[PDB]
Amino acid sequence: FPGQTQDPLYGYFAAVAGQDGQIDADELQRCLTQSGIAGGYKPFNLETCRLMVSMLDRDMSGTMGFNEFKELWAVLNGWRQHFISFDTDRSGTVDPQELQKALTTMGFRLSPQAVNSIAKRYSTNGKITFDDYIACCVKLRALTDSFRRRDTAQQGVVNFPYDDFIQCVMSV
Amino acid sequence: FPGQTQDPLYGYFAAVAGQDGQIDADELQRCLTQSGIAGGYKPFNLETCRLMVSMLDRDMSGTMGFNEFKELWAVLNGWRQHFISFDTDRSGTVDPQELQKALTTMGFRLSPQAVNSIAKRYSTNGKITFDDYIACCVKLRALTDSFRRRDTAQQGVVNFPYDDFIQCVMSV
């Protein structure tokens, strides 16, 4: 094509993908660190990266390709952007109520009780860090997609058989 | 008052519980390492410690007491024995076929897909470590309790409203 160019994100990726163009949660964690997506904030944990791989692992290989990495970057940027509009104090952490308003604006639709529940799960010393916030986000997106694809009748309710429920949530 | 003896596990605990007699996840990691419960080399990662503290934090303090530690030790040994039964090459790690064996002898009857989902998410590099096997055991227990708890028809199928499905999985 006439307007082709080198993708700036490929370098970070190629540096850890080796010769098969695929990366695991460990490698994903390293290249994301270099990419600097976590701005000033602390680097992502291996667990959060594990959730990230799972969220985009369409063929269940426990790995991720460059195109998937590109998707992730787009998504993580959106969430950090949203997180930023709440970390006024620029503390690298956010308030429980600020979290309720963050989730609601980014598209999620949870009840006050559910939000309270989620806030409690990721609250360390009253606050929610950037790492936990993102972890929360990928897991929310991940579980909501699955639920969504099982509810094409869009009734907000799905009958989960035990085996399906287990294989579904254990991945995230 | 005969038959009384010093509990052999008390040493590990008190060495870290400090004065208040409670331990958080980090200290739990240290106690468990000293007790030599984990294979022999690598200690449990912090997510798995968070999971174990959560599994026994009945008063929601984010800490654990000695009695809860003893109870944890009991559960941990039970799971570990099933692991040992199938770590044929005493590698300290198991593969997908071996994991389904440990899980089945433990009572679970998960499908190839469920077991494969578990393995891929918890796979350091093609086999599952004892550490991830435990974390996996803790989540499986929490999620299975949540599912059964809701099986009204006792048919192995649960009707999950979205909000409820979310709070249930996000709490683990």
CB-based contact B165 A147, cutoff 8 Å: yes
Residue B99's domain spans which residues? Answer: 1-172
Which residue in chain B is spatially nearest to A139 when comparing CA positions?
B170
> Tokens representing B87?
């770590």
> Tokens representing B22?
């409670």
Closest CA to B165 of B150, A128, B152, B141: B150
Contact A65, A22 (CB under 8 A): yes
Q: Which of A129, A170, A171, A172 to mutate to test the interface with B (most CBs of B within 10 A)?
A: A170
Q: How many domains does chain A have?
A: 1
**Distance between CA atoms of B87 and B81, rounded to whole angstroms?**
10
Q: What is the resolution of this structure in A?
A: 2.2
| DSSP SS3 for A128 | strand
What are the φ and ψ backbone dihedral angles of A27, each rounded to 5 degrees? -65, -40
> Tokens representing B50?
């968070």
Residue ranges of chain A whose CB lies within 8 Å of a chain B CB? 24, 26, 45-47, 50, 54, 57, 60-62, 110-111, 113-114, 117-118, 121, 136, 139-140, 143-144, 147, 151, 156-163, 165-172
> Greatest CA separation found in chain A?
53
Closest CA of chain B from A138, distance in Å: 11
Which residue in chain A is spatially nearest to B172 when comparing CA positions?
A121
What are the angstrom distances between the C-alpha of A22 and each of A45, A46, A119, B138, B159? 19, 17, 34, 30, 38
Q: Domain containing B133 — which CATH number? A: 1.10.238.10
Which residue in chain B is spatially nearest to A154 when comparing CA positions?
B162
